[PDB]
Amino acid sequence: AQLKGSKTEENLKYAFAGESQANRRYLYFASKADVEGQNDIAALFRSTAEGATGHAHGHLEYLEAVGDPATGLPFGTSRQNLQSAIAGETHEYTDMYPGMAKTARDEGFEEIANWFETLAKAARSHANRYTKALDGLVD
Amino acid sequence: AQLKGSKTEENLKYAFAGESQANRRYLYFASKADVEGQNDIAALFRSTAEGATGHAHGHLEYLEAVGDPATGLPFGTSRQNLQSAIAGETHEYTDMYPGMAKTARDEGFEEIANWFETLAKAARSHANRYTKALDGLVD
């Protein structure tokens, strides 16, 4: 409770975002090393990526006291988690990805705009699957 | 249309941050569902998390030439990837995590301050390991 509204809450959200991206980045770097045949480098990136998973996990555990960094909604139980995932996916397909696609098209990046539209379609599908799972949940 | 400096470059970085966090959040939610015995919700979170990994990979593919979301540095080859990883980890241990630790301590969240300090030390260790890997890289 004391954490809500603090600068530390904001720092935990920022650090969660950074560590989440670090895992994704390090896995991407590992996949590039795979193709290069840099097998030791790939293993190092995968090991450090696992460290970033633990860091992000810890940040999110502290944030369970205040809300999901992506939606502000409570998280913990599957009911709460599904409700938050639905809100996030709905934001992605309604606003974020279509907005990014329009700007990509405005700026002349047609392939990127189509990519964003593909991800809007994916987010709509994921929102609908989460909604169905929530409907079926008896707790 | 030049991607570097465009609004679309910034949107790719932002979308990458969101998809990265989505994977981390969804794996956390999947583990909560495991404990509750909600096996299908757990699998659904894991399946959707795997989709988020693909989305993040696709965003990074577009960003290779313009710069790593975390550092602004070019990425793609193992040498570039190690240089960028070192830069990012060095920022975490010299600036980001120490600053977050100081703020948490000032706000009275002593355990969280120690958590940030632990992560500063971890980032220093990551930077050191990446530096040794770069120093011996055969490319």
Characterize the main sheet of chain A. Answer: none
**CATH level-3 fold name of the largest domain in chain A:** Ferritin
Strand content of chain A: under 5%
Kindly state the number of beta strands of chain A: 0
**Full CATH superfamily name of the largest domain in chain A:** Ferritin, core subunit, four-helix bundle
Q: Under the CATH scheme, which architecture of the largest domain in chain A would be assigned? A: Up-down Bundle
The helix-strand sequence of chain A is: HHHH
Protein chains sharing the most extensive interface: A-B, 72 and 71 residues
PDB class: metal binding protein
Keywords: peroxidase, metal binding protein
Assembly: dimeric
Entry title: rubrerythrin- E53A E124A
Could you characterize the architecture of this molecule?
2 copies of one chain form a homodimer. Chain A has 2 domains: 7-63, Ferritin, CATH 1.20.1260.10; 78-136, Ferritin, core subunit, four-helix bundle (Ferritin, Up-down Bundle). The first copy, chain A, has 139 residues and is mostly helical. Helix content of chain A is 80%, strand content 0%. Chain A has helices at residues 7-36, 39-63, 78-106, 110-136. Chains A and B meet through helix 1, helix 2, helix 3 and helix 4 of A and helix 1, helix 2, helix 3 and helix 4 of B. It is classed as metal binding protein. The entry lists the keywords peroxidase, metal binding protein. It forms a dimeric assembly.
